[PDB]
């Protein structure tokens, strides 16, 4: 028993991290086979930032301008291309530590592990969610660009995020590994702001089920509610609408605990209207929304990876 | 910016995890050089548990009774010994992936990363603290015994915990890697209970400094307080006494933020007496105590590891 914000083991990803230096900018890159992936704003300079034309900036570069260090071995660039907002630097050596991998573009509400890195060296690992407003609440300092987010599925690494910038509210914005930003953000220094966020309702319900599995039950009740009547309460408290598909996904957890999904919704309803009244759930005094139904099942059942 | 419960990168430890099977019991072991370390209660059987004599139980074993699998390669045991509550199984192959390492016995209040494992395969990584009552609030299911906790310091892994059991309150108890339990616990099935815990005061102050570094300031005040007068309030709310040594350790954080340590204590004092009044600190509605002063400096400054 017990329930923790758990990240995936990071080893498979650590073996892919490299340092990319161009001009006065240094950041991280991801070395898979003979390609290094990194944010395209590495070719920018501190005066280019204002409104750059990356196509013009890249045609002006030569391979030898890209300094790629994999630990203490310095990788020679033999080619370069740009796909949306990522650079792909082709190197003459394939990474022998390349895991089985996929590039996947995730939906808001889904979670992933972030391996934060500086100068090609990992600093730490933690679990994030993609907020409904397509930011992530990370921990990122100067130099962390090119750090990736990922999930693991048995032996395969699914890369889903690479870090590009921080927004004025202190939240973070980035792309998928094919370089498409999550949300409306652009790799241009302009007025950009996160936009209104909401709470990930299906995840809160998942976490309440986690609580029941682990022996917290003070928040349950005999009441029920309808999907419609629940969603009317959710909107009042800035929660995402709950879909029938969400209800279906919460099926196994409902079956393991014997608490019908719509009964758990009646419990959330009362928690939203009454607060928690000095009590805690799974060591938290707030309703937690960065655990998916999959995360809960995974941790409460013991799935592993090779 | 941002502040997260961050674990160390787990790669160095993942390469050491193995499966140890003896009789009807399966659990994890730690393979460093030509030795596999694992909890001695693997030699127990479901009727031995009541009050075992491990010296008698071990003299009765042969090397071939110990089934050690390192992935898909099955390690031959050539010797076995017992050091306190751990077994050391000597194998005929040295782990080529053995990191630089040390075994260290930590103080309560110190934090570490746990790589949770089943059948020799890692499942996830998260950050724990050693509670003042020498338990840890982990996430552990059947089969997780032998999972380790660790810190990293540049390139060296300092192993500090191996998992043995769960206590009736759902918290966890274990040993250092030399097999000495943390706290009064014994690897015997009897009436054992955690005992009263307290909040790690110096860590709460560290986390308040983290908050200031990251732009949360609503809890500050112009007041101050004396060490003595602070400790009188701490005791009322079941907080650990703050020592002058704690104050000294909080020195750099005090210097970076310009908030004298005793001023931050006056802030904690008011938070304890008034609660948070609907507000949050670093996304938490509770005072958080599982970040050390070192953890805060590390994450707010960008230290890395190879």
From Swiss-Prot, chains A, B:
3CL-PRO exists as monomer and homodimer. Only the homodimer shows catalytic activity. Interacts with host FBXO22; this interaction promotes the proteasomal degradation of nsp5. There is a cross-link at residues 5, 90 (Glycyl lysine isopeptide (Lys-Gly) (interchain with G-Cter in ubiquitin)). It catalyses: TSAVLQ-|-SGFRK-NH2 and SGVTFQ-|-GKFKK the two peptides corresponding to the two self-cleavage sites of the SARS 3C-like proteinase are the two most reactive peptide substrates. The enzyme exhibits a strong preference for substrates containing Gln at P1 position and Leu at P2 position. Inhibited by pyridone-containing alpha-ketoamides compounds 13a and 13b. In turn, alpha-ketoamide 13b (tert-butyl (1-((S)-1-(((S)-4-(benzylamino)-3,4-dioxo-1-((S)-2-oxopyrrolidin-3-yl)butan-2-yl)amino)-3-cyclopropyl-1-oxopropan-2-yl)-2-oxo-1,2-dihydropyridin-3-yl)carbamate) inhibits SARS-CoV-2 replication in human lung cells. Inhibited ex vivo by michael acceptor inhibitor N3. Inhibited ex vivo by compound 11a and 11b. Changing residue 145 to A: Complete loss of 3C-like proteinase nsp5 cleavage. Changing residue 205 to V: In strain: Zeta/P.2. Changing residue 142 to A: Does not affect ability to cleave and inactivate human TRMT1. It is found in: Host cytoplasm; Host Golgi apparatus; Host nucleus. Cleaves the C-terminus of replicase polyprotein at 11 sites. Recognizes substrates containing the core sequence [ILMVF]-Q-|-[SGACN]. Cleaves and inactivates human TRMT1, preventing tRNA guanine(26)-dimethylation of tRNAs. May cleave human NLRP1 in lung epithelial cells, thereby activating the NLRP1 inflammasome pathway. May cleave human GSDMD, triggering alternative GSDME-mediated epithelial cell death upon activation of the NLRP1 inflammasome, which may enhance the release interleukins 1B, 6, 16 and 18. Also able to bind an ADP-ribose-1''-phosphate (ADRP). Residues 1-306 form the Peptidase C30 domain. The active site is at residues 41, 145. The chain holds residues 3264 to 3569 of 7096 of the full protein. Residues 1-306 are cytoplasmic. This is 3C-like proteinase nsp5. Signal peptide: none annotated. Changing residue 189 to A: Does not affect ability to cleave and inactivate human TRMT1. It comes from Severe acute respiratory syndrome coronavirus 2. The lineage of its organism: Viruses, Riboviria, Orthornavirae, Pisuviricota, Pisoniviricetes. It comes from the Viruses.
